[PDB]
A paper describes a structure:
A successful example of this approach is the allosteric protein RG13 which is a molecular switch created by recombining the nonhomologous genes encoding MBP and TEM-1 β-lactamase and subjecting the resulting library to evolutionary pressure. As a consequence, the RG13 gene confers a maltose-dependent ampicillin resistance to E. coli cells. Intriguingly, RG13 activity was serendipitously found to be negatively regulated by Zn2+ at low µM concentrations in a non-competitive and reversible mode, a characteristic that neither parent protein MBP nor TEM-1 possesses. The structure reveals that the TEM-1 and MBP domains are in close proximity to each other connected via two linkers and a bridging Zn2+ ion.
Two types of crystals of RG13 were grown in the presence of high zinc concentration (2.5 mM). These crystals belonged to space groups P1 and C2 and were refined to 2.30 and 2.29Å resolution, respectively. The two RG13 molecules in the P1 space group have a similar conformation as the root-mean-square-deviation (r.m.s.d.) for Cα atoms is 0.39Å (for 636 residues). The two connecting loops between TEM-1 and MBP could only be resolved in the P1 space group (in both monomers) although these loops, not unexpectedly, have higher temperature factors than most of the rest of the protein; part of these linker regions comprising residues 317–327 and 583–584 are not included in the C2 space group structure due to lack of electron density. The residues of the linkers closest to the MBP domain that appear to be anchoring the linker to MBP are residues S585 and R316 as the mainchain and sidechain residues of these residues make numerous stabilizing interactions in the P1 space group. In addition to the two RG13 monomers in the P1 space group, there are four zinc ions present with two zinc ions bound per monomer. The Zn2+ ions bound to the three different RG13 monomers can be grouped in two different classes: the main Zn2+ ion, which bridges the TEM-1 and MBP domains, and the non-interdomain bridging Zn2+ ion. In the P1 structure, residue E477 (E121) has slightly shifted away and therefore the main Zn2+ ion only interacts with H468 (H112) and both oxygens of D164. A similar zinc binding site is also present in the P1 space group involving the same H509 and H514 residues but this zinc binding site is expanded and also includes ligands from a crystallographically related RG13 MBP domain: H39′ and Y17′.
Numbering used by the authors: 1 to 637
Amino acid sequence: KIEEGKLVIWINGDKGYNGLAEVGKKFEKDTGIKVTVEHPDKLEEKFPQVAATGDGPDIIFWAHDRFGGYAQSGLLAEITPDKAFQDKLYPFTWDAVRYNGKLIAYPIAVEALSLIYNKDLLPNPPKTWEEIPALDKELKAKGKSALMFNLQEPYFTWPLIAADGGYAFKYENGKYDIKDVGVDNAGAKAGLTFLVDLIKNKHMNADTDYSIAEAAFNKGETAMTINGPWAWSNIDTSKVNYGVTVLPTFKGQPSKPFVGVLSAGINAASPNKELAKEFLENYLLTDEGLEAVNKDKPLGAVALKSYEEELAKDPRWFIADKSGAGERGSRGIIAALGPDGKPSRIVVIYTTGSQATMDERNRQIAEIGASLIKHWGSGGGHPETLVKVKDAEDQLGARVGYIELDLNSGKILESFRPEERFPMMSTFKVLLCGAVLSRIDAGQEQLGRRIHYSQNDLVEYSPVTEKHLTDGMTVRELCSAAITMSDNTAANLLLTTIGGPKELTAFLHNMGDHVTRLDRWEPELNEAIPNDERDTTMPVAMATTLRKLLTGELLTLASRQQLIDWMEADKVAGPLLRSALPAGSATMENAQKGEIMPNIPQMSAFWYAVRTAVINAASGRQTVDEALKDAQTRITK
Ligand SMILES: [Zn+2]
Ligand SMILES: [Zn+2]
């Protein structure tokens, strides 16, 4: 039995438990209830043992993946935060602690691998996996190395393997499909192939494990390592000048590290469930409570939005971006906004001129975006938002176009220069894929259909298409790249499927848009000559057209949802919500791009199977194709 009138907490010894105990002393001062923080050895094993009998701690802190089994045996209580409190934490962290519809833990901290680099050896780290071979050659010639990380465990190699489309178990409608495994797909092959190619070409050694890589980085022998927040303290002691950043992209798409959510569960047998709620919600999950814990030992990243914004201020994450790939997107934004994950408004913004830079445009767009979320519920058209839009035209020194629209009813909520013509830039790309999906609905096109192109077909800013020269790309992939990664060649290839700019224009006119026109291809359509009517639209015309594609019956329910999905990813990567829904620390950035650890018992077989596969493809016993075929079988039939 658990003692009433006190809080007993179990947490791992490597966590900031002395900070946690300080939060408990503050709880004691206010309520008179003492909180005892302990770190039992193998509490991960002690908890399921004692809690079944009715004993143990009131609160247990562990990563979410273990909490699936706990909640199955009925060892955790359903928590009851209200909407106000839930909106304080990142939405994706609430999913990690959801079991059979019920919230079974409070999300606390967020952990994922990051790229850790030596700033003296490498002040500007690679954004890409493909550029590492050449960096290794430049480094080995000066007595160093580019990258060293643990190759023995599939936890460390998976971010690269999953990058191009690999996955453990598909997660749909809030449930894992134990028959849908993606370790055998084309994307998992490409990643492991590239991995084995780094070994073959002597860029990495197949025998490299955790201790070897760590010693190598902490002694300045290697430019980069891949590790988590648990490793920082040792690097701090080594006095290596290090930064922590986003993992490199493989094939133009982010690495996908497994994401662990340190979570606080409440014993089902606890008679202090209400006090546990009071402490967790109103003491621990505050900036002051998490600061106390973080000061003791680094949390990496947290689930509480407000404190993650403080973590993001840490100089270690600071990067120097030089690419002007965001230039088009800062001159043209389209976004379907809506809360609870459901869109109800359409925003169209264009900026112009040859004066303002990319950052200045991105900042102005972010400000308009923050102003929109600030005054939600008011319906739209808040005079504040109009001033922000007017400010953008002011500070950018050129015409700005703007409209805000209710998606369902077509009602104009706010407008500025809505019937003036603006170069579409990249904003035609959603309309292009609307036309594509129109062909799918008519059985004229398949999303899985594969397109060939050579290097000659490549134009500027094509980060995905340029990395699929040998295997080509799928219509579905092309649209994803065109919209979410703003791939220019992807846009052209898609244009060619429908018959060129003239057919997109015809498609738009056939649905009642007699204003919008695409005349040229990428990258020409971006020229934006003053008063040139080629490749232009109006804010109102664009908003209405977009509205008709996401409403009514122009697309099937299947095709409509697909367009919605693509548009959201473009929105969260665009500058619009960069102030309102800001990026966090490097650990959080990697976690948001990654794959939440599945909390199912079937994950055990996955680890063994992938572990063997990576060993056998690296050594030689199996080819990459064969090794993953076998690993897939070991998991599912
Ligand atoms: Zn691919
Ligand atoms: Zn017409």
